[PDB]
């Protein structure tokens, strides 16, 4: 898998290039905001267990057919496994935010998911809503606008990280559509 530094050395290797003083100008800016990136991964894993049950339970209360007899979240065996994979999904996104590169979200998790949810029978139009609610939460925790828990950071701005995590939660929306 790759991170933000192994991504610029697979693009320069394609042209048999060295990395200049101008290819480095984004990497010295990557480690300049490096403290702000750790300070935003830690804002998500600290609310991680609450974020999932926040999200799967919203998926049920919008579409109550998921819990009807013969539904997908019917038994306790099946509802427990939906809360597992809503937590596997959020686990891999924070790997991508920590590395700054979707190479681990899109190869260890998403490589094979769309045909797998076809084989089991997971509805897709509801499992977009699970990842869509977790996208609304994770930009509120990063931008510190969650309505029921603030955290304590140094003052500044994290709109760049708030959209990179929005850019990662919809690859998941695209790789099962």
């Amino acid at each position: 898998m790759l991170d933000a530094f192994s991504r610029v050395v697979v693009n320069s290797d394609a042209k048999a290039a060295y990395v200049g003083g101008s290819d480095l100008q984004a990497l010295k800016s990557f480690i300049a905001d490096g403290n702000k990136r750790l300070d935003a991964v830690n804002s998500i894993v600290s609310n991680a267990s609450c974020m999932v049950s926040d999200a799967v339970s919203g998926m049920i209360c919008e579409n109550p057919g998921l819990i009807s007899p013969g539904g997908n979240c019917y038994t306790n065996r099946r509802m427990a496994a939906c809360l597992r994979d809503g937590e596997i999904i959020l686990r891999y996104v924070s790997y991508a935010l920590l590395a700054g590169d979707a190479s681990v979200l899109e190869d260890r998790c998403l490589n094979g998911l769309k045909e797998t949810y076809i084989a089991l029978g997971v509805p897709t139009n509801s499992s977009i809503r699970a990842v869509s609610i977790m996208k609304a939460q994770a930009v509120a925790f990063i931008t510190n606008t969650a309505t029921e828990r603030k955290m304590s950071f140094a003052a500044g701005d994290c709109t760049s990280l708030a959209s990179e995590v929005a850019s990662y939660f919809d690859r998941v929306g695209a790789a099962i559509s």
């Binding site: 790759l2 060295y18 990395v19 003083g21 990497l27 480690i31 750790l38 991964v41 790997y95 260890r108």
Partner: protein, 164 residues
């Protein structure tokens, strides 16, 4: 790609965990040490032709049998490939000074390197005779800072220990 980041997110994936405080602390050391290797990287990326030619003719100065017939460097086109490979390794060492680990050197330079040079009769000590020339050539405040000299010449004798 053996990085600092890819190590702590692979161990955190074999066990099914989230990132934790030991993982974020590891990437903190990827900020202090990063400056002393990102300027060894640009120092080699600007002056790479002068060190590939200085080391390229150090293979042949020690082993002057290499330009005999039947050997590996008998004609100019084999010499043009021999000076190409020393350029191929310095481009990989420049990559390891950027990603922090020994990612690109292992994935692209050493993987499978041992059984090809035996098959194509390449004397592999002539490869390390140029990298060990590049190692003992560096001046301590002239070329780069003293922390770049220990970071650039750490990836050298990792490659020297790999090839021999």
């Amino acid at each position: 790609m053996k990085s600092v980041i890819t190590t702590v997110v692979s161990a955190a994936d074999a066990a099914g965990r989230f990132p934790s405080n030991s993982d974020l602390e590891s990437i903190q050391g990827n900020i202090q040490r990063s400056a002393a290797r990102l300027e060894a990287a640009e120092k080699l990326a600007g002056n790479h032709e002068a060190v590939v030619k200085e080391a390229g003719d150090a293979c042949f100065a020690k082993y002057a049998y290499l330009k005999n017939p039947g050997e590996a460097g008998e004609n100019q086109e084999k010499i043009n490939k021999c000076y190409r490979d020393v350029d191929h390794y310095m481009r990989l060492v420049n990559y390891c000074l950027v990603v922090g680990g020994t990612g690109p050197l292992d994935e692209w330079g050493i993987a499978g390197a041992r059984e090809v040079y035996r098959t194509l009769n390449l004397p592999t000590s002539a490869y390390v005779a140029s990298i060990a020339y590049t190692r003992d050539r560096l001046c301590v405040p002239r070329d780069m800072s003293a922390q770049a000299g220990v970071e650039f010449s750490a990836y050298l004798d990792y490659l020297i220990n790999a090839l021999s």
